[PDB]
Structure formats: C-alpha cells, structure tokens
Amino acid sequence: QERNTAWWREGTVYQVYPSSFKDSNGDGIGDIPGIISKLDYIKSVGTDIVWLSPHYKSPQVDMGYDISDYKAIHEPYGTFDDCIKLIQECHDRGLKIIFDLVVNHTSDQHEWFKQSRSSKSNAKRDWYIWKPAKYDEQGNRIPPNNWESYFGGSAWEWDEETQEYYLHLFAKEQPDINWRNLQAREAIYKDAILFWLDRGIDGFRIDTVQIYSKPEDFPDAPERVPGQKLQNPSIIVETGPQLHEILQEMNRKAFSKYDIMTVGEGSPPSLEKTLEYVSSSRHEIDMLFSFDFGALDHREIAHTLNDIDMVEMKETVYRWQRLVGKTDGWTTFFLENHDSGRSISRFASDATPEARNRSTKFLAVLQATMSGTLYLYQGQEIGIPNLPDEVPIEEYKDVNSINYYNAVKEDTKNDPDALKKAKKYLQKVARDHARSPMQWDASKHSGFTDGEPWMIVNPIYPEVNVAAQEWDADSGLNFWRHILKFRRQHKDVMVYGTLEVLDKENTKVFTFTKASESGRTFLVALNFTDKAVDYDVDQFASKSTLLLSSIGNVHHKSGSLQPLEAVIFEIH
Ligand SMILES: C[C@H]1O[C@H](O[C@H]2[C@H](O)[C@@H](O)[C@@H](O[C@H]3[C@H](O)[C@@H](O)[C@@H](O)O[C@@H]3CO)O[C@@H]2CO)[C@H](O)[C@@H](O)[C@@H]1N[C@H]1C=C(CO)[C@@H](O)[C@H](O)[C@H]1O
Ligand SMILES: C[C@H]1O[C@H](O[C@H]2[C@H](O)[C@@H](O)[C@@H](O[C@H]3[C@H](O)[C@@H](O)[C@@H](O)O[C@@H]3CO)O[C@@H]2CO)[C@H](O)[C@@H](O)[C@@H]1N[C@H]1C=C(CO)[C@@H](O)[C@H](O)[C@H]1O
Ligand SMILES: [Ca+2]
C-alpha cells in the first residue's frame, strides 16, 4: 500500500455546514447551488479540501446526522444531480471534497429501521440493538442499564408494539446500528461508503468513529456524575471489542481501493491506543479529531463552565502534536466546528471591534503553527463570535440546546437562577454559535438569504462580514490567507515539524518550538492574557529573528508580549 498522502497531510480543510453557508433561492435554508456559487471564495481563503457536513435525506432531528437514506439528497439542499455537480465544481477549481460518514446510527425514518421495529420476526430486527425490559423491587419497568443518551434522558426508547427497548446514544430518532450483525455491515458498506466513493468524492470525515462496537453485556456506566441515576456511557463504548475489526474491514473493502483521506471524530486518551487507529502500519484511518482541547473550558456531562488552566492546555496540545515525527501516525488541529462555540469568544476576546480583529489573528497563529492536517470552520476566517447575551434562548434551535434547557426547566421547576445559569452555559459553548448563517456582507441577514433565515444571523454582521474584510489588508481574512501561505512555504516546520514545550510552568505565555528533520526550528510564543507580560526570547533561544507577530512586527516590543500577541521566531 504505497499512497499519495502529502495532499491530505499538507492540505487546508474548510468545513461547510450546508443549511447555514449560502441560500440561493430565498427559502432561508442554505443549499448546494449556493455552495457552488461560493467555491471561488472558499478557494481564495487557501482551502485545498472541502468537508461537507451531512446533506443526505434526513428529517433533520439532528440537522442531518439522522440519515434516512444514504443514497439520496435532502430536497432543500438540491437534487441528486446538484450533488454530482458540486463534486465536479470542486474538482474544476482544484478543490478536493470529503462527505460525512454517519453510520453509528440512522434516522428512525430509515427503511432499515421501519422494518426492524416492525416485528421481532422481521429479517432486519437484529440490524439494531433491541433488549428486553427489566423490573425493579416495586415491579415497575426500567431499562436494561443506567446509560444516559449524549443528548439527555435514557439511552433506551420503549417500543410498545414489540415490547422491547432499542438503543439510541443520540436522540430517540437516531437508533444505533447493531455492528455485530454482518448483514447490517454489508448494507452500510454498499449504501453509505462505496456508493459515494464510486461517484468520485475524495474521502470521509467519520462521525463518532470509536463507538460502533458496544460491549455484549451492556454493563452500567461508571458514576461520572456523583449521585446521578443515569450515567453517560462514552468511557465504556469507546474502542469496543469489534471496533478495530470494523475499521479494518472498512479499510480493506473500501478506503484502500480509492485515493482518499479519512479523519475520525473522537480519539482515545493514550498515545498507543490512538496509534491503533492512525498508525499507517494499522491500515485503518489516517487521522483523528481529539475532543481534549475543546474541553479545556467546560465539562459537558455536568454542564459546568471553568477557566482555562494554561498548564493543562500546554499538556493537551503536546499530547497529540507528539504523533508527528516520533511515530508513523498523523494528527489534526482545529478550534471550531458545527458542534462548538466560536474560538475568538472562548480562547481570546470578542469584547470590541479592535479585540475581535486582534483575536482572529492571535488564534490564526496558534492553529497555523500546529503540525498535522489543519481544519477551518466556515466563518472562523472572518472572526464570527458567539451569539451575544441579548439573543434569547428561543433562537437556540439545536436539539441539544433545547433538550438541556428543558431538562433544567423540568428538574428545577423553572428555578429562575437555574435557567439563567443554563443560558450562560449555552451562551459560551452551545452548538448554535456555529450554525448562525455565514456573514457575506452588510445587507439584510448579511446577504446569506433573500428571504428569512432558518436560524438568526449573529447581530454583529454589519461589522463582521466577508465584503468588509476582502479589501482591508488589516482584516482577519487577509491575515488567514497570509498565514496559510506562510504555513505552506515553511511546511517542513509548520506541517511536519516536531513540537516541544518550553517554559512549562509559565501561566501567562505558551512557548513551543517546531523543528524539522533538516534541523530548521521556529519558536512560537502566545500571550493569552489581557495584560502585557515580560517575555525574554533570549532565555529560550541563543539566536532568534522575528518572522511575524499577530499585532504587526512594528508593534512588537523586545522584552515583552502585548495582550493576545502571538509571535513566530526562527531560532538556532
Ligand atoms: C456532540 C458530540 O457529542 C459527543 O462529544 C461530546 C461529549 O458528549 C461530551 O460529554 C464531552 O465528552 C467528553 C467525555 O465525556 C470525556 O470522557 C472526555 O473524552 O472528554 C470529552 C470532552 O470533554 O465532549 C464531547 C465533545 O463535544 C460525541 O462523542 C460526539 O461524537 C458528538 N458529535 C458528533 C455526533 C453526533 C451524533 O450524530 C452529531 O450530533 C454531532 O453533530 C457530531 O459531529
Ligand atoms: C478577566 C477576563 O476579562 C476579559 O475577558 C472578557 C472578554 O474580553 C470579553 O469579551 C467577555 O468574554 C465573553 C464573551 O463576550 C462571551 O461571548 C462569552 O461566551 O464568554 C466570554 C466570557 O467568558 O468577557 C470576559 C470576562 O469574563 C479578558 O479579556 C480576559 O483576559 C480576562 N481573563 C483573565 C483571567 C486569567 C486567569 O485564567 C488571567 O490569566 C488574566 O487575569 C486574564 O487572562
Ligand atoms: Ca435555499
């Protein structure tokens, strides 16, 4: 297996969320012709690869991650031929395109499930996870175990007709596939994987890549939340008894037969268990998204917010940057996605127009200097921030946001202090901050739509929009275009280099080196705080030359780092 791998190792990925990128026909929903009309723009950012979020036929309970037919397109996004055309349009512009592979579960509207739920005697009954009910000391019906769904409530839904519980780690409308069933495996390989590989896509982002294989005895999850009755089972369903077997099968039957890239969502906590997924010697997948960085400011199982521990952040970056150079594996780096809040609001400052611009550049230096495959999310390049405090809870259309808030409403009997704390939690880390439509210009709804958008546009759009940043040399967009050019030109150090952490105990400045096998070495220093901090590069490098600062080289002062100032020096 000798492959073309440089294109995905060095490539810049731009993730498009179809419902929110560009509406071509005034119904308020983004669509594929709209995407096609903005591919020139996507290319102009420095993108090599487009990651298209789910666009298949789907009732949109979980905005496309509940799929009812892998071989058909969500009608608002366009026709089947619109999708074939999008692939060609990307290829025409020198852009690769990867689709989202969501096969841990399907919609409850998928024909497979309609048949499986039909009857215990149906041929596809075993294609999903059906378990009998249990009874307590008082004789009341209870589910097989304490598993909590990732979206709240029990992970088992009761089907009255067949008197059995079915598993759903996500919503009740997303029943989980039984990956022990070999007939289910074959139908998924045919419909979800090879159908699209045969129509010329360049690979897949694999949704929840670690949780396909459940442990046969479905035991109770550990007490992760002290005193709570239900417990999230992520820690026991990840890397299950058949997981590696399954990825090996996907590789042998499909991924190895085409010139593609595969990135899986979710990584183990250890280097060696991670290498079981991404070591090129394992012939499974190419790279993984780790949730570790995204978890530095909140704990989702307890819905709590916390201040970022700078030392923990250093250890978290090094943890997965380690893969490049010292192993035959690969890694990824990203600050934003369709499941996260905006990076400038969470890791920098969105307080003022000046701060929004400064913050966009600061985080661009942090991402651009990380080894592995770099991923951008639509709007990260212009610095879209979180929806402000004035946006009411009713605008948070995400099912996860609605479920959590409603859980607080029910369990606290509308305690207004509890709801305010719930709102504040969501204002920081809800998925809705990524789904507010892309901001093209200062017209009505930022030019995303001629009609009324499905989701409210962030009200900062008159200032923050593509049109306002295009011809301003000082904009976040032009900073991103420049730093991606810098990254490509110095790929030995930025893409493929080995990362080492210096000045570890410093709680205000993160300093790391990027070194290529040739010996060429860069030193990167980021002041994450709101105050100027004394910083002497001569204490970490004998000789250094400033290459760039996120605040402008002429504003860099020797002996210190300004608030949210990131600098790159060539050393040795
Ligand atoms: C949305 C996302 O849910 C899962 O990821 C999050 C977990 O639910 C959180 O609890 C938290 O996980 C932590 C683990 O509990 C902990 O053991 C440790 O590993 O750290 C984790 C981070 O603190 O954070 C996770 C990241 O948000 C789930 O695993 C992930 O796959 C889900 N995302 C995709 C799944 C679906 C289902 O189709 C979609 O709704 C999303 O759009 C997907 O992209
Ligand atoms: C103390 C803290 O103040 C500043 O942080 C503020 C931001 O500048 C504001 O933009 C605002 O951020 C909120 C966003 O508007 C909002 O969208 C939301 O989602 O989250 C943000 C709230 O967290 O409010 C912030 C005040 O909370 C300042 O920029 C920042 O540096 C300051 N952080 C200090 C904390 C540490 C300890 O970890 C020390 O190193 C320094 O005192 C500062 O770094
Ligand atoms: Ca539309």
Numbering used by the authors: 10 to 581
Paper text:
The structure of BaAG2 is composed of four domains.
The solved structure of BaAG2-acarbose complex reveals the binding mode of α-acarbose to the maltases: it is positioned in the active center cavity with valienol moiety based at the bottom. The −1 subsite is lined by side chains of Asp71, Tyr74, His114, Arg214, Asp216, Glu274, His347, Asp348, Arg440, and one water molecule interacting with the valienol moiety. Ligand residue at +2 subsite is stabilized by the side chain of Glu309 along with seven water molecules in the close proximity. In the BaAG2-acarbose structure the position of Asp216 has similar orientation as in the case of other structures of α-glucosidases. An additional PVP molecule was modelled to chain A of the BaAG2-acarbose structure, where its N-vinylpyrrolidone core was positioned in parallel with Tyr505 at the distance of 4 Å. Additionally, a water reservoir is observed in the cleft of the bottom of the active center (W98, W106, W109, W126, and W657 according to BaAG2-acarbose structure numbering), where acid-base catalyst Glu274 and stabilizer Asp348 are making polar contacts with the first water molecule W126.
